[PDB]
Amino acid sequence: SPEEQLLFLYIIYTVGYALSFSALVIASAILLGFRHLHCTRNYIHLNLFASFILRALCVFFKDAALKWLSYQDSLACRLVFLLMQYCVAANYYWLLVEGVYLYTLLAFNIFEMLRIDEGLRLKIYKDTEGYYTIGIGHLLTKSPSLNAAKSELDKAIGRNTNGVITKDEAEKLFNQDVDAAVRGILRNAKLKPVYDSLDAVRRAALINMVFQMGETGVAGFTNSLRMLQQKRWDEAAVNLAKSRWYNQTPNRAKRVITTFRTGTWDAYSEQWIFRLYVAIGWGVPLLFVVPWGIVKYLYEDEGCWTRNSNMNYWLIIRLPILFACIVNFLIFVRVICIVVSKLKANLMCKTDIAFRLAKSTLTLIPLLCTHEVIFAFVMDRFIKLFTELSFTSFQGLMVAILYCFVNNEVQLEFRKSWERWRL
Ligand SMILES: CC1(C)CC([C@@H](Nc2ccc(-n3cnc(C(F)(F)F)c3)nc2)c2ccc(C(=O)NCCC(=O)O)cc2)C1
Ligand SMILES: CCCCCCCC/C=C/CCCCCCCC(=O)OC[C@H](O)CO
């Protein structure tokens, strides 16, 4: 039956957007409700969720206006259609920043953490404590003798120093120092169990402490190390604030303690970057959506602009999205090369956030951009292609699943809350 086919596809479409709307509101409520989920990653998720929620609101509004001049001739319809077009471009560009954030998350590590904290020195300098230092936090000897310090650096670099050391030599010594730090931790009886239980991010935090203080130094934090091994992060944060380390160097200590408490790099992020993300996800759609609306209002205005087959006006809305998908696939490829690298070199386990986040984002990219690339310049089997509506309806539900409901951290929050109710 012809009419029966159209009706049944209508049902699956509307229940797709119903399940998606409900799931996205529930998932955003989870991300906002639990305080431990308040990190930049989940904020980016919340903006993506909002774009999908608004898309669903447009769908329900268009459907609800069918009940009670026809609706195709009104201007309210053209406004709802323009808002929906905006939401679609927002989906694709917040997916773009999702991918960009993932890439930079894979590019940050202990080496960059320490290059921020310790600084770079070109010449020998006598630090406040009496130690001569150079490079990236490379302390030589407390011996108050510039002559002997330059010699001690000469044997530890290979060539004659004279005082000035190039950037390459400093990076070489920096790798040496970081490897010594990890070998120290694994050769310590009070630090190996906790380091082996920590995730890569909190591992880098522990290494940071060892790079500043020392192997036997941080082993003195008996009280904090025990509760770090017990997954009780917040207790250990407040405990680490009551330290000599926190009062001597507070700005570095707060960054490291944040990394322990949350397991993220948020304490090393620049805050204008997130504003550039919001200027991409919400701002750039505004930059090609509204001229399309202007030209469709002045030069192609017939039935809420549904007859979009005349001129270049279809391209000014489809070339930007193609752009956002092209880059999204290039990111898609590059990320893969990185992840399989870091997994093979045992720099990363499949239990870390970078891998799980790639496990979701690498799914969504070819799930949302492959249609746009395949039919790139095609303007316009009927039942079989009407199955695009089912997937575009269930898109937001899948976003809520892959970015909330199967996330391990939120499942932790639910079990922790039930445990609080029992005890
Ligand atoms: C629709 C499906 C049938 C596909 C989906 C599935 N996709 C998926 C699974 C594995 C790899 N993968 C492995 N190795 C590589 C390599 F090569 F390294 F890149 C990629 N890639 C893609 C999926 C499963 C599990 C999750 C998941 O737990 N999310 C929560 C993690 C989080 O948000 O914190 C997400 C997606 C399920
Ligand atoms: C709205 C219209 C519906 C269309 C929706 C169809 C989506 C099906 C995906 C096709 C992938 C094609 C290109 C993907 C590239 C292959 C790479 C790959 O398989 O990924 C490896 C990694 O391990 C895990 O993704």
Residue numbers in the entry: 136 to 203, 218 to 257, 1001 to 1160, 261 to 372, 380 to 422
Sentences from the study reporting this entry:
To study the effects of these sites we made further constructs in which we mutated back single point (C2333.36bM, named M9 hereafter), double points (C1932.63bS/C2333.36bM, named M8 hereafter) and quadruple points (C1932.63bS/C2333.36bM/A2714.47bS/F1962.66bI, named M6 hereafter). The three new constructs were crystallized in complex with PF-06372222 in the same condition as the M10 crystals. As a control, we also measured the thermal-shift data of apo proteins whose melting temperatures decreased by 5–8°C, suggesting that the PF-06372222 indeed stabilized the receptor in each mutant. Fig. 2(b) shows that compared with M10, the M9 and M8 constructs have similar and slightly lower melting temperatures, respectively, which is consistent with our finding that residues Cys1932.63b and Cys2333.36b are not di­sulfide linked. The similar melting temperatures of M9 and M10 suggest that the endogenous M233 residue and the modified cysteine residue (CSD233) contributed similarly to thermal stability, while the ∼2°C decrease of M8 and M6 indicates that the back mutations of C1932.63bS, A2714.47bS and F1962.66bI slightly affected the protein stability in solution. While the previous M10 crystals were collected to a completeness of 95%, we could only collect data of the three new constructs to a relatively low level of completeness (M9, 88.8%; M8, 77.9% and M6, 79.9%) because of limited resources. The new crystals were processed to the same space group and structures were determined by molecular replacement successfully. The densities of key side chains indicated successful mutagenesis of specified residues [Fig. 2(c)].
GLP-1R belongs to the class B family of G-protein-coupled receptors (GPCRs), a group characterized by a 120–160 residue folded extracellular domain (ECD) followed by a canonical transmembrane domain (TMD). One class B GPCR, the glucagon-like peptide-1 receptor (GLP-1R), has been considered as an anti-diabetes drug target and there are several peptidic drugs available for the treatment of this overwhelming disease. The widely accepted two-domain binding model suggests the ECDs of class B receptors recognize the C-terminal helices of their hormone peptide ligands, thus facilitating binding of the N-terminal region of the peptides to the TMDs for downstream signaling. Wild-type TMD of GLP-1R (residue range 128–431) is extremely unstable as suggested by size-exclusion chromatography (SEC) and thermal-shift assay. We have previously described that ten thermal-stabilizing mutations were introduced in the TMD structure of GLP-1R in complex with two negative allosteric modulators (NAMs), PF-06372222 and NNC0640, and we showed that a di­sulfide bond (I3175.47bC—G3616.50bC) and a GCGR mimicking mutation C3476.36bF are indispensable for crystallization.
